[PDB]
């Protein structure tokens, strides 16, 4: 009876769904809008599986010929590719979080934890605000379509049932790329606050018996927030620049 | 133009406005007390902190109603935007 064939087809479909979920979960981790602190575990998994089902039924998933016998190599390849994809897609949020954190450190609110790594202020608020701002701007500028297209490209480059080789020398530059972008973006605030505290130091040099630390903290806070406000015109296009850069970057990671 | 960016700039603008007066009073007091200490050679840091505390407390006490009114207006605007998001 054809019911047996139906059961076989459904179970094969479920296996493929499990594979796509294997690839998608790291992406669902390194993403600060569907972060696992705002979506319940009883809603996250069905959404992930529905996305996987839509992707596979749309015919945008590439499958080879089941070349590698042992499934463990396939599993670890899928895990590492998922981690690489998540890192590629989390770069704008991470770099803006870093910008916020270093600006907060410049202000001095988290300097207590900078001195003592045990206590103080180890949680930043301006950094979280910047992270949310960048996340929502990316999301409403076409983020979901770009993420899905990146997933499709990842499937295209390294298909599910094949072995692919990576560029180590090209994936070892992620950390320096992140740091460079953060320092580039936060350069105005950094230089303004540094010059302000240098000038206050000169004032203290010409004013011997005076406490300059509290005044420095106050002026740093005010100047930092003013500069951030007047700098809210150089943030939008960076999202599109990150679109192009991350797309070509993730393209140039495998032995294509 | 990009309602999200508009709201972010509005929030930063409100931040600057709210934090202007107390921060300014604190830094003016600190500089004045430091100059006085330099002139009369006392070398004591407790007086500027105490007077700063008094001034900041008084200013924050005085500005509470206006702070609340502006924040409530902003929240009502946010709710209005939510109604037709």
């Amino acid at each position: 009876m054809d019911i047996s064939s139906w059961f076989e087809s459904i179970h094969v479909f479920l296996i493929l769904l499990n594979g796509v979920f294997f690839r998608l979960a790291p992406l669902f981790f390194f993403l600060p809008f569907l972060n696992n602190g705002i979506i319940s575990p009883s809603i996250r998994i069905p959404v992930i599986f529905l996305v996987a089902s839509g992707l596979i039924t749309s015919g945008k998933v590439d499958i080879g010929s089941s070349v590698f016998e042992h499934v463990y190599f396939l599993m670890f390849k899928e895990i590492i590719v998922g981690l690489l994809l998540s890192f590629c897609l989390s770069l704008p949020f991470w770099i803006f979080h870093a910008v916020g954190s270093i600006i907060d450190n410049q202000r001095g609110a988290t300097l207590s934890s900078s001195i003592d790594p045990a206590n103080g202020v180890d949680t930043s608020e301006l950094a979280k605000f910047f992270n949310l701002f960048s996340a929502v701007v990316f999301l409403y500028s076409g983020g979901m379509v770009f993420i899905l297209e990146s997933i499709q490209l990842s499937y295209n480059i390294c298909p599910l049932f094949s072995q692919c080789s990576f560029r180590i020398s090209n994936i070892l530059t992620f950390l320096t790329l992140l740091a460079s972008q953060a320092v580039i973006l936060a350069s105005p605030v950094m230089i303004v606050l540094l010059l302000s505290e240098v000038l206050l130091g000169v004032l203290s040099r010409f004013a011997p018996q005076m406490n300059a630390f509290s005044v420095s903290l106050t002026i740093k806070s005010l100047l930092a927030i003013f500069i951030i406000f007047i700098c809210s015109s150089t943030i939008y296009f960076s999202k599109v620049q990150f679109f192009l850069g991350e797309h070509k970057f993730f393209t140039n990671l495998f032995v294509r | 133009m990009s309602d999200i960016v508009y709201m972010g700039n509005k929030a930063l603008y409100l931040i600057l406005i709210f934090s202007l007066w107390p921060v300014g009073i604190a830094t003016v007091i600190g500089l004045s007390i430091g100059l006085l200490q330099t002139v009369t050679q006392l070398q004591e840091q407790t007086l500027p902190f105490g007077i700063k505390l008094i001034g900041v407390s008084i200013s924050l006490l005085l500005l509470s109603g206006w702070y609340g009114e502006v924040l409530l207006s902003f929240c009502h605007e946010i709710m209005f935007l939510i109604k037709s998001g």
Binding site: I230, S233 | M1, N9
Partner: peptide
């Protein structure tokens, strides 16, 4: 809308144009 000023929000710029 004076040109030599502060931030000059985008509505002012579009009005100038």
């Amino acid at each position: 809308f004076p040109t030599d000023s502060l931030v000059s929000s985008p509505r002012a710029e579009k009005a100038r144009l």
